[PDB]
Amino acid sequence: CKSTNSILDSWINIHSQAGYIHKLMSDQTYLKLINDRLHNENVNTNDEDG
Amino acid sequence: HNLSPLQQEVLDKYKQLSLDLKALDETIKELNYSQHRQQHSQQETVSPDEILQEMRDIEVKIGLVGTLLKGSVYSLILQRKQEQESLGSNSK
């Protein structure tokens, strides 16, 4: 029973992280920001502060 | 108080019987002690840590594995049925 519980808490952790990052991927603004961040790093990787 | 030899044999047999009687009573109790890690012990004795406190702990989250798949499939079927009845009733 204890081992089953441990497996289930591992599943719980996985699904919690899945939900958080799904919330992240839900917002279009953050994805746009990381997209032009990728393009900026393509043109200039130095300006991380930008 | 002198006694017949048969009576004395009955008596000390009764004594031994009482001895393993309270021995078995102590054993059954020790099984029933929920004193797991409360008294000096490191073995689990059948108690809520084997029952609802534990099995229910499992159960409040096992539904997230088994019954939730069904529930999702049933919800899709229910939505499909809703769409079908709406279209059928409104089209005619």
UniProtKB/Swiss-Prot annotation, chain A:
Protein location: Nucleus; Cytoplasm, Cytoskeleton, Spindle pole; Chromosome, Centromere, Kinetochore
Domain of life from the UniProt record: Eukaryota
Family: Belongs to the DASH complex DUO1 family.
Functional note: Component of the DASH complex that connects microtubules with kinetochores and couples microtubule depolymerisation to chromosome movement; it is involved in retrieving kinetochores to the spindle poles before their re-orientation on the spindle in early mitosis and allows microtubule depolymerization to pull chromosomes apart and resist detachment during anaphase.
More info: Present with 996 molecules/cell in log phase SD medium.
Subunit structure: Component of the DASH complex consisting of ASK1, DAD1, DAD2, DAD3, DAD4, DAM1, DUO1, HSK3, SPC19 and SPC34, with a stoichiometry of one copy of each subunit per complex. Multiple DASH complexes oligomerize to form a ring that encircles spindle microtubules and organizes the rod-like NDC80 complexes of the outer kinetochore. DASH complex oligomerization strengthens microtubule attachments. On cytoplasmic microtubules, DASH complexes appear to form patches instead of rings. Within the complex, DAM1 and DUO1 may form the microtubule connections.
Protein name: DASH complex subunit DUO1
Organism of this sequence: Saccharomyces cerevisiae (strain ATCC 204508 / S288c)
Gene that this sequence comes from: DUO1
Part of the whole protein covered: 100 to 149 of 247
Curated annotation (Swiss-Prot), chain B:
Keywords: Cell cycle, Cell division, Centromere, Chromosome, Chromosome partition, Cytoplasm, Cytoskeleton, Kinetochore, Microtubule, Mitosis, Nucleus
Domain of life of the organism encoding this protein: Eukaryota
GO CC terms of this entry: cytoplasm; DASH complex; microtubule; mitotic spindle
Record keyword Ribosomal protein present: no
Localization, UniProt: Nucleus; Cytoplasm, Cytoskeleton, Spindle; Chromosome, Centromere, Kinetochore; Chromosome
One Pfam family in the UniProt entry: DASH_Dad3
TM ranges: none
GO biological process: attachment of spindle microtubules to kinetochore; cell division; mitotic sister chromatid biorientation; positive regulation of attachment of spindle microtubules to kinetochore; positive regulation of microtubule polymerization; protein transport along microtubule to mitotic spindle pole body
Entry's family note: Belongs to the DASH complex DAD3 family.
Note: Present with 468 molecules/cell in log phase SD medium.
PANTHER family, per the entry: DASH COMPLEX SUBUNIT DAD3
Known role: Component of the DASH complex that connects microtubules with kinetochores and couples microtubule depolymerisation to chromosome movement; it is involved in retrieving kinetochores to the spindle poles before their re-orientation on the spindle in early mitosis and allows microtubule depolymerization to pull chromosomes apart and resist detachment during anaphase.
Subunit structure: Component of the DASH complex consisting of ASK1, DAD1, DAD2, DAD3, DAD4, DAM1, DUO1, HSK3, SPC19 and SPC34, with a stoichiometry of one copy of each subunit per complex. Multiple DASH complexes oligomerize to form a ring that encircles spindle microtubules and organizes the rod-like NDC80 complexes of the outer kinetochore. DASH complex oligomerization strengthens microtubule attachments. On cytoplasmic microtubules, DASH complexes appear to form patches instead of rings.
The protein, known as: DASH complex subunit DAD3
Gene name linked to the record: DAD3
